[PDB]
Design a protein around this ligand. Sequence first.
Ligand SMILES: *C(=O)/C=C\c1ccc(O)cc1
Length: 125
Amino acid sequence: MEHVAFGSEDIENTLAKMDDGQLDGLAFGAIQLDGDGNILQYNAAEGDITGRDPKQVIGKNFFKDVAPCTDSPEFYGKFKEGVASGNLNTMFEYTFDYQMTPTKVKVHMKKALSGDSYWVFVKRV
Ligand SMILES: *C(=O)/C=C\c1ccc(O)cc1
């Protein structure tokens, strides 16, 4: 298992070296979205939390298709604000409840080191 702590200050640098396979080795869920909310990456830990099969969600829009409970000012709103601002680094609790047992989680969104890509890190609370 890759040794990286949720919420680590330089997490974006560390994950820039990881391929989809090493990303599956994290202790928390990790989703990479492009500026429009499309899923580029989605690790195994996230699949365990959301129950969705990784390879099947990639390419799908996170706010419209996959996680509609996140289509709100509290989640999607902070994301859209961050993309347009070109900066994003926020953490908060949220409850995941679309087609799944209501699950409380800690979310951490942060701009990737890459160009137009952003990270959503998820862990159980
Ligand atoms: C609200 O809907 C939050 C998260 C979420 C994640 C994965 C899937 O499939 C649905 C919903």
